[PDB]
Design a protein around this ligand. Sequence first.
Ligand code: CLA
Ligand code: CLA
Ligand code: CLA
Ligand code: CLA
Ligand SMILES: CC1=C(/C=C/C(C)=C/C=C/C(C)=C/C=C/C=C(C)/C=C/C=C(C)/C=C/C2=C(C)CCCC2(C)C)C(C)(C)CCC1
Ligand SMILES: CC1=C(/C=C/C(C)=C/C=C/C(C)=C/C=C/C=C(C)/C=C/C=C(C)/C=C/C2=C(C)CCCC2(C)C)C(C)(C)CCC1
Ligand SMILES: CCCCCCCCCCCCCCCCCC(=O)O
Ligand SMILES: [Cl-]
Ligand SMILES: [Cl-]
Ligand SMILES: [Fe+2]
Lengths: 34, 31, 32, 33, 82, 36, 505, 341, 39, 30, 30, 56, 55, 63, 36
Amino acid sequence: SYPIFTVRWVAVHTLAVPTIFFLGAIAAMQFIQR
Amino acid sequence: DWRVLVVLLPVLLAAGWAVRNILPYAVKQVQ
Amino acid sequence: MEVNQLGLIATALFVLVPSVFLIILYVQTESQ
Amino acid sequence: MEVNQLGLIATALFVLVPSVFLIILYVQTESQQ
Amino acid sequence: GTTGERPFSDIITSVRYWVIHSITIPALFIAGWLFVSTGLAYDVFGTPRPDSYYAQEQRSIPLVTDRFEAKQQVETFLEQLK
Amino acid sequence: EPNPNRQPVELNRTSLYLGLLLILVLALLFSSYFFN
Amino acid sequence: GLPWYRVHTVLINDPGRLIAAHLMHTALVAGWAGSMALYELATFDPSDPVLNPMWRQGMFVLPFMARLGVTGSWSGWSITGETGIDPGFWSFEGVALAHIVLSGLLFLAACWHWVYWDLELFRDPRTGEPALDLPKMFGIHLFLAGLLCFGFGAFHLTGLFGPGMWVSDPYGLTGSVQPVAPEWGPDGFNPYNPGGVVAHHIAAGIVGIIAGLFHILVRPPQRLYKALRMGNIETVLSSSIAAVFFAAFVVAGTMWYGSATTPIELFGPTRYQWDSSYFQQEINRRVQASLASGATLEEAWSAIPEKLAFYDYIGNNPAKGGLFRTGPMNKGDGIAQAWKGHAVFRNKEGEELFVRRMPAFFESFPVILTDKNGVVKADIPFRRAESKYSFEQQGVTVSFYGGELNGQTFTDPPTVKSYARKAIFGEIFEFDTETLNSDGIFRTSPRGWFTFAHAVFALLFFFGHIWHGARTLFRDVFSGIDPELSPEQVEWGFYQKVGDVTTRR
Amino acid sequence: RGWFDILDDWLKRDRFVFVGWSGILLFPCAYLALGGWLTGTTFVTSWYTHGLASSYLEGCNFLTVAVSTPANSMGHSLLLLWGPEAQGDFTRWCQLGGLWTFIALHGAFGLIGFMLRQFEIARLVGVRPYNAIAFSAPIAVFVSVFLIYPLGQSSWFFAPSFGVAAIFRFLLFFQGFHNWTLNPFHMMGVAGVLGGALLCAIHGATVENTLFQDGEGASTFRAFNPTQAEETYSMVTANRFWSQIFGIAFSNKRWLHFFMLFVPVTGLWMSAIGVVGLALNLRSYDFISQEIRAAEDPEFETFYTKNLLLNEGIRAWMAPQDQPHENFVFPEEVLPRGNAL
Amino acid sequence: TITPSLKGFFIGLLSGAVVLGLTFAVLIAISQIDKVQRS
Amino acid sequence: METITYVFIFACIIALFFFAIFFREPPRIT
Amino acid sequence: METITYVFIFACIIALFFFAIFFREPPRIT
Amino acid sequence: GTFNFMIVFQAEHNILMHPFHQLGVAGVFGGALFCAMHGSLVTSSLIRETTETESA
Amino acid sequence: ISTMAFNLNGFNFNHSVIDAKGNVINTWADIINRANLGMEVMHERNAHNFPLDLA
Amino acid sequence: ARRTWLGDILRPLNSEYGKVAPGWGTTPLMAVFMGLFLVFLLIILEIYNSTLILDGVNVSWKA
Amino acid sequence: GGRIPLWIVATVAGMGVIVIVGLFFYGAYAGLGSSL
Ligand code: CLA
Ligand code: CLA
Ligand code: CLA
Ligand code: CLA
Ligand SMILES: CC1=C(/C=C/C(C)=C/C=C/C(C)=C/C=C/C=C(C)/C=C/C=C(C)/C=C/C2=C(C)CCCC2(C)C)C(C)(C)CCC1
Ligand SMILES: CC1=C(/C=C/C(C)=C/C=C/C(C)=C/C=C/C=C(C)/C=C/C=C(C)/C=C/C2=C(C)CCCC2(C)C)C(C)(C)CCC1
Ligand SMILES: CCCCCCCCCCCCCCCCCC(=O)O
Ligand SMILES: [Cl-]
Ligand SMILES: [Cl-]
Ligand SMILES: [Fe+2]
């Protein structure tokens, strides 16, 4: 019987989701040509 | 802008899919 | 070497005054 | 005036060194009684 | 002791967890990838593309030199690439 | 009419060694700048 | 026994001996101020407020006396250069004397309160323990501060009943003490508007009079009294240090950047006047006016006053000094004697060249001459074997306009170069280097020494704030934590609210 | 039970991540300094302020990305997004340096938040707040280096920029323009940082190598019970070892751990003070007596003079690109250079 | 007389007010649901 | 004068080492 | 500097006068 | 002479850009950090064994 | 220090970013390089007769 | 303790040690003045910073 | 709730990070920032 939405939850997603978005962004950058 | 919708498209899917799969358990809290 | 003349006294006092202060406090701790 | 520049550290230590010796001896006397 | 939230060892081993995060994680990866492939990151943040650092014949940098005319200075440098 | 708030002060020998070392090392450091 | 760093804590429950210590501290400070002034009077040369003003002479308190109206000496000179004034008692010498006398009376007051510490006024009637009603004292002291603050703005600064304050033109040429009217409305908040200082003190004084009255009459609410431990005098120490280091940063900022209360004729130029070529721009305006009224170069430059030229010189920029380069600015570049005149450099083709000025960041800087456009045209090279722009090759000359050298041209490259090496410092002056045995190295001004010292003290005092702050709020465990602390209060989950036992489970 | 007391109850609930009242300051400002740095090193240029690329998007790597300081021409502008420079235009704010002040000011308030959090949690749990007090030294470094130092200079342009190689450039700027290694405040700071590393290592090694045998295992980590009453290592044997190896040794466990707070904390404070002086160019750049002899005696050479020749090369070879707003043009023939190189 | 930057000034003034207002509404609201319990 | 000063201060430190080792407060097991 | 020294020493004696009078060891009969 | 050595090392090897030196800085900054930390935390949790007038 | 003794030196990113035409777009590494070159050309100023300082 | 004339005259001014308005008293009124003051210090800062430019306010020595 | 074993998510997570960073090192030689 645990919550699933907690303060903790907000904290982890406040960090984790931008991280993944940022990583896909940076990935795509390796294939930019000048 | 046509680009601000493709960049946002997959994110809503993710959030809707996570909603439709945790929506019952999150109504149990309600306290 | 054309150093600053007051350097000597500034250094001498810089040492003497705090050291003397600690020696005073130490010697009167020992005698009580 | 064109005085001896060491006259100052001569004077400072002349006052300071013997004075500190008396002060040390007096403070450790007072904390005996 | 515990402060009442579900243990992490329990969640990342849970199946429901991977049902949800098999989609959400890649979706976010794809969104960031698109942010850059569409070229939308350049226009949002003001970052030059490799062809827009200089004009074709210029070698000097577009340095801003006025505090209050500065936004208008940057726009002037950008029109002079056309 | 003696004041009740007076306390004896102390400096142990170890504290004297530490303080003396601090002052001498500070003088060795700053003296070159005093002389300039 | 008490450790050395805790000795002064015997004052904490002894308000009479605290007053004594505070009296002794005040006697020390007043005595230093009188001491400092006398040393400055013994060493100050009043004979040249143009090229040898006080801020070149390492005067620190002299400008604080001058700022509020003291300008003359019992020996009959004024810092404005007026001979024959009769300052009255309130001369530099009379101010110093008064601080000495005051130091001595306060010294005797401090002995009285030390000997007669056990006064009934300091003990609480209810309980017979020493007690101070700090909220009421705050109200009293706050009301007093407001009256003084009001009176200082309403009477001293207005000249209603007092001298006024130092005010100058925008280029520091015509400073003097003047009554100042208050500036209500919005430019009163402009730091360079002196009317704002007057208004600040009138209006701020009234508010403090009122707040002081509020604070005498209304007790603090219990919530605030418990939260801030208002029966503990270290809470005042804590909050007072915070207010002091706040004031200490503001006065460093305003001294560094400039304000109507830190005039350049008292503390010297700011570094920003050099960065933005402030004095150079004005000089150049005056010259391009004179030429429009049909004046020669010699006449247009001859009309630039020495005072104004001296400001366009990097040796007066307070950001050119060094921490262990001690003494007055005159111990560096010398005692300034005269403007040599404005140097104009030309190449063989008659085109005029301009020496790139030294920025404040650089201890040393090369000599580069550009044309009106910025193209490099002449330099003094390091490797000569491939030099293209040397003064020899480019036929560089220097001609002077105004000052000692007016109407002279030099052509031999060695002389032209030495004047170019000084042009990187801005305008060129004759200096007496012999009198003080000056060494050639730039020193900072009182504006720099004030700013350094106050910024450092503000930052240290921040640490004092945190230290006494923590001791006030943690007094209960200052000697250590509870030896029978329960694992339940510090381990996780057991209390729903941290450190509150009523929430168990 | 007012609303203030109910809010206090919830903010101080025991939860995985404690919030408190300090959290209302700490979490928004920390996250925004973090988020802003990450955003700016991933996506934002320094082309208009510095003539520099500074993001992954431009093909910088982790060592060379930075959130770079604003243009000299902004002065000490707060560079508010709604202020007169950027006029609410987000894109142009990024291009003028807004993220630098965004990070620098949110970070300063986050640091306040963190120290308040230390006080807050320390008060709730019942311990003395020496951890808060020690954290004063990081705050003093951050405030003197990132705020005071530029405020005494012409502009934020000369603060450190937020990146790895940007900070190295800082380092070297300070050598060539300020002679910061010669500054006794920086030396004291060096001694407290190295000394603190020394203490860290020597205390941990000493304790690991005077454990009592409190279990039968070759892994000695399991023979410690946190509730146990007894010292887990021998102070007495440790003191004899060091007294005979080094001549003195700690005998007081409390003095030892206070000394450990004191050294690194005091070091950072001292270096802070030196940097405040450098805000003003109040340098320990020179030794006058050495310069007076050197100038008259071309055969007098010391390591002090050699280093200043190095400083002079740094200044001339690095100024035009490092301070582009000055438009320094240095013809080859004025560049200071020894033979051949 | 209202200048561009005074308009800017009020904007960020109204902005901060809103941000702080929303924060404490949420936090008071949550704290009123998720009340501690005391025997 | 400055050479003497530096060496003087250095010499006082070496003597301090000697006293601090051989005339420390002995640590006693009390 | 020599003027300061002279007046400092003079000042110190006057202060000594004050302590020797008002903060003397009080003479107590037997 | 130590500073001479450091400056010239940087010219000739770009030691600042070398990850082993970056690890040295993590080692020493971290060492000081953890030194202050451990001292402050033991010092914060000293058991009350003394009055306010004596050294703890 | 022991491996730089054998001249295996720090990362070199000098002129590593270039634009579509091939102008060099400096980074902070290039600014470091400008300071390194000021150290290089001035250290031991009378000691090199040949253009590379190889040890 | 020693009584003195001046002491007795001042004695009322130091006699309410510990006395507190109940509860929260004027705290809300204090908070309002604090918030006003912060706004006001903010205006002063931004004028000096030239982030807030007002008509007739020339933050220069040429004021 | 607890079915997928920990060692497996570690391995997978671990290979996933290897790939993303491996790609970053690839990019240090290709396209922008490669010096070519
Ligand atoms: C520190 C507090 C303080 C105080 C006591 C005053 C007091 C005064 N101001 Mg200043 N004011 C302040 C701060 C303050 N002001 C600040 C921070 C600003 C922003 C720059 C201004 C802007 C301002 C303007 C623009 C004008 C004044 C004017 C005035 C006067 C008439 C007020 C009026 O009815 O305006 C009537 C006229 C107007 C055009 C409306 C202006 C309203 C102003 C903003 C009122 C501000 C004061 C108010 C009482 C707030 C303080 C409360 C405080 C005691 C808690 C009065 C002497 C006016 C005047 O006649 O002097 C030239 C005027 O034109 N003030
Ligand atoms: C607010 C402080 C203050 C300020 C700004 C000034 C400013 C000035 N004074 Mg004044 N002065 C002051 C206080 C101050 N004074 C006091 C208190 C005295 C009495 C001692 C004097 C006595 C005095 C004299 C006698 C003279 C001046 C002079 C001057 C001028 C030159 C200063 C100079 O060369 O400094 C040089 C500064 C230094 C070398 C800096 C010292 C700082 C070092 C680093 C010591 C700190 C190290 C510390 C111990 C580290 C400990 C670490 C530990 C905690 C762990 C200048 C305008 C001179 C002048 O021109 O007169 C007209 C002059 O002759 N002043
Ligand atoms: C208004 C200023 C003020 C006042 C009244 C106090 C008062 C006190 N402090 Mg605080 N403190 C302050 C500012 C202040 N402090 C600041 C700015 C700092 C940060 C630097 C501290 C840091 C601090 C600590 C860490 C401690 C205290 C302690 C104490 C208590 C004992 C002090 C003592 O016995 O010293 C004895 C001091 C000496 C015998 C000599 C010290 C010599 C100093 C370092 C150099 C001399 C300076 C010199 C004379 C020039 C004057 C400086 C002036 C111009 C600024 C006392 C209640 C102690 C305490 O809590 O006791 C429980 C304690 O541990 N204070
Ligand atoms: C802890 C929260 C916090 C703090 C301290 C800051 C602090 C700051 N932010 Mg950040 N910010 C935050 C959260 C926070 N922000 C959040 C959550 C976001 C995302 C929405 C942002 C987004 C953001 C941006 C985009 C920018 C800032 C900026 C700023 C700076 C200027 C702020 C300003 O001018 O406010 C002015 C507003 C106030 C001070 C608030 C007014 C407060 C009261 C209500 C005024 C009225 C008082 C009244 C008279 C009395 C009431 C009494 C009471 C009982 C009701 C400053 C460093 C700027 C910056 O960094 O630029 C370099 C900037 O451009 N912030
Ligand atoms: C008794 C009497 C009298 C007399 C008086 C007198 C004569 C006084 C004097 C007084 C004085 C004359 C005082 C002074 C004081 C001083 C001071 C108080 C000082 C201090 C200083 C310091 C504190 C310093 C510090 C420092 C140093 C040393 C080094 C560098 C750094 C610094 C700055 C930190 C009369 C008859 C009137 C009346 C009756 C009674
Ligand atoms: C600024 C801004 C803002 C905000 C923002 C934000 C909040 C952001 C966030 C962001 C974020 C939050 C981001 C993040 C990112 C991340 C990343 C980018 C990461 C990466 C990572 C990595 C890459 C690592 C890896 C590794 C390694 C290297 C080794 C070991 C292993 C590991 C895995 C750990 C706003 C809106 C207000 C607006 C204004 C501006
Ligand atoms: C005249 C200029 C027009 C600008 C209008 C648009 C820009 C407004 C964006 C403001 C973003 C909100 C963040 C401000 C809140 C941060 C301060 C705080 O909350 O304490
Ligand atoms: Cl060399
Ligand atoms: Cl060679
Ligand atoms: Fe330990």
